Write a protein that binds this ligand. Structure first.
Ligand SMILES: Nc1ncnc2c1ncn2[C@@H]1O[C@H](CSCC[C@H](N)C(=O)O)[C@@H](O)[C@H]1O
Length: 424
């Protein structure tokens, strides 16, 4: 097998953790390290359990030598520093656990400049670049505010690599739903599209992991990392994606510009209905547009002519109207805005969908495969969106806007009400 694996496996028996009746060895699988059922397991069977003594959460850092100095930091920043530091101490509780952690994953946060060029024009690149920079500024701030003014607690220097290594280990291993917890033993199961339950989470302290599927002997025990993450999210959080086109998403960002002559009123309408000055709408392949996207698009493109809808008079129905539609001019405007954005975006990629699909037909390397898959999907979504609005441009006269809806209850053909007027 592998030295480190045993130096870690044993350390688990010597901690009391892995008992004698735990059907699950740790072997090498296509996805690195994994848990292979030592014998037939069945739905909901407890695979293993670990002592809170072994976690690595915001409480562990607070209840440690550096908890005082990290008393103010956000939880994820706190944990990174603890991880980096614990890693340096050749007398840390997790000396052997650190000896098993991969020095890297396929998460876009580790991709070289060449590998990242494979994502040119993708929203995943923007997101990865944006996240990388932000974790950087945050970690350079931690260096001068805590790491440097305390060289006693932080002996060895800390590089950007040191931080990123940790930020990754936290993003691809920590168990959220229980919010950041590490569990050296159960921190081995891999993800499988086969699992569709997501019930594995459980704790009697003691972390208890149970197999969601029935696994025969020799096979690998899996779990569903997350049924809702988009492919772009799986790519950055862990180092992998799924072929399932229903995981492809593209998130649209909307906002009420401050240079908008009706900013104040518009903002009041949006917040009054659950939306901020800035709103993010996730668009998944083959799904129907998110509720609120169209009305918010209409609010953004409002304009002088229909500005009358922002008066106190409609401050109680304005959203219902935005939901139905405002006017052909408003509708036509937003449709073009979206369509242009899609085309603009689509043109930012360096490969066609056909090229991506042909590439997929051959043998691609982990990261290259991730890039191709992601970009093909984003292009699919982008085109789906543009298609939806191209159709709306055609059906531009099938919609009954405000004015029409208004004159629907005129009652022109009522009675000769003048006969009564003369009877008093
Ligand atoms: N279905 C899958 N395909 C590819 N890699 C996977 C995977 N499920 C899990 N992984 C890998 O394992 C990580 C989760 S931690 C699980 C243990 C890991 N296999 C190891 O050897 O250390 C992920 O971030 C990813 O790099």
């Amino acid at each position: 097998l592998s030295p480190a694996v045993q130096t870690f496996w044993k350390w688990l028996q010597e901690e009391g953790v892995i008992t004698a009746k735990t059907p699950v060895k740790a072997s090498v699988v296509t996805e690195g390290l994994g848990l292979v059922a030592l014998k037939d397991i069945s739905r909901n069977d407890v695979i293993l359990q670990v002592p809170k003594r072994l976690w690595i959460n915001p409480d562990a850092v607070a209840a440690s030598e550096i908890g005082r100095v990290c008393s103010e930091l956000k939880p994820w920043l706190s944990v990174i520093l603890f991880l980096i530091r614990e890693r340096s101490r050749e007398d840390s509780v997790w000396k052997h656990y650190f000896g098993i952690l991969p020095q890297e994953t396929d998460s876009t946060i580790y991709w070289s400049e060449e590998e990242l060029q494979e994502l040119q024009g993708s929203q995943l690149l923007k997101t990865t670049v944006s996240v990388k920079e932000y974790v950087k500024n945050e970690c350079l701030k931690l260096e001068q505010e805590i790491i440097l003014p305390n060289k006693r607690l932080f002996p060895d220097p800390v590089t950007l690599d040191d931080f990123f290594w940790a930020f990754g280990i936290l993003r691809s291993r920590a168990f959220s739903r229980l919010n950041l917890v590490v569990v050296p033993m159960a921190d081995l199961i891999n993800h499988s599209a086969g699992v569709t339950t997501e019930d594995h989470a459980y704790e009697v302290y003691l972390f208890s992991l149970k197999s969601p599927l029935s696994v025969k002997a020799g096979e690998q025990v899996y779990i569903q990392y997350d049924l809702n993450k988009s492919n772009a999210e799986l790519a950055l959080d862990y180092g992998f994606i799924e072929p399932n086109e229903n995981r492809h998403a593209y998130t649209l960002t909307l906002e009420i510009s401050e240079s908008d002559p009706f900013f104040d009123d518009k903002l009041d309408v949006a917040e009054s209905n659950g939306f901020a000055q800035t709103a993010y709408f996730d668009i998944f392949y083959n799904r129907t547009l998110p509720p609120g996207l169209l009305p918010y698009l209409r609010l953004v493109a409002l304009g002088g002519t229909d500005a009358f809808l922002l008066e106190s008079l409609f401050r109680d129905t304005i959203w219902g109207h935005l939901e139905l539609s405002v006017s052909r001019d408003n509708e036509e405007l937003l449709c073009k805005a979206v369509r242009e954005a899609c085309k603009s975006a689509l043109a930012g990629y360096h490969t066609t969908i056909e090229q991506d699909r042909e590439l997929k037909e051959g043998n691609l390397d982990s990261r290259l495969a991730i890039a191709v898959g992601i970009r093909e999907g984003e292009k699919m979504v982008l085109q789906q969106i543009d298609g939806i609005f191209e159709q709306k441009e055609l059906e531009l006269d099938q919609l009954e806007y405000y004015q029409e809806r208004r004159l629907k209850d005129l009652g022109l053909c009522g009675e000769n009400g003048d006969i009564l007027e003369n009877l008093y």
